[PDB]
Symmetry: C3
Subunit: 105 residues, 3 copies
């Protein structure tokens, strides 16, 4: 029984976000994906301010599967450079955690 972690990744739209989630679930690299639509990203690129629609993905997994999950997401990105960050979890519901660990075989 398994420490958890929350992985944030950005997708350009709902269909991409959905398909991504499906794949990493199928591979048992995450137990649950949460997808938040409607977001805007702003950032400079090559000297210009960009403003883009996004879906914020929130992926729940254990510290044992974190590197492979990260590897998988980076493999699917068109330029192998996903906006991908890991936040530490300092506590779960231990029953939800039991399910999370069980889901990952």
């Amino acid at each position: 029984n398994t420490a958890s972690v929350v992985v944030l990744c950005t997708a350009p739209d709902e269909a991409t976000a959905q398909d991504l989630a499906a794949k990493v679930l199928a591979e048992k690299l995450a137990a649950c994906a949460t997808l938040i639509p409607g977001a805007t990203s702003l950032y400079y690129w090559e000297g210009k301010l960009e403003q883009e629609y996004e879906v914020q993905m929130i992926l729940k997994t254990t510290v044992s599967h974190q590197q492979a999950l990260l590897e998988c997401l980076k493999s699917h990105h068109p330029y192998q450079t996903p906006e991908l960050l890991v936040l530490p979890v300092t506590h779960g519901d231990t029953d939800y955690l039991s399910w999370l660990n069980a889901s990952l075989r």
Copy 2:
């Protein structure tokens, strides 16, 4: 006073608002934020489920953490809320003072 962010999931905005109001009244959280319209994907019994959900983001202090996790768990139909606690390393000092001024 240190603060934490608690994440939890509710099936619809109506139960999510009810639960927010209750934990705020019991002074287990200072602020509860709700984002409906989320999609959650996961496996059940070998088939992929896809449901709409409301993401909850609850702000509280470490000294109120356990008691929050407990009213939340009691409250969940099967007693297994999707509940995850994130550490906060810093922030606004005046905001944080107000967080603690609840209790």
Copy 3:
């Protein structure tokens, strides 16, 4: 040589406010990317009545070296100098993304 990253959460009332705020902190190189999430409602007691209010949740990505200046700027822009502002530590991951967030800021 890359610095650690952080996530800064800040709350804004609406898209116009949040987008003006993001543009200014970006132009000043205090954050590398700002994500705005509309659709949030917050509930809290204030003077001491239960309020419910619509919000835009801001997620700002920056380095530990620029954290304090970012906090200071956002605070200064807030109409009461008291922004709902929290910092979360990042423990990993994508090295190219991290290299870009660093290059963005100097």
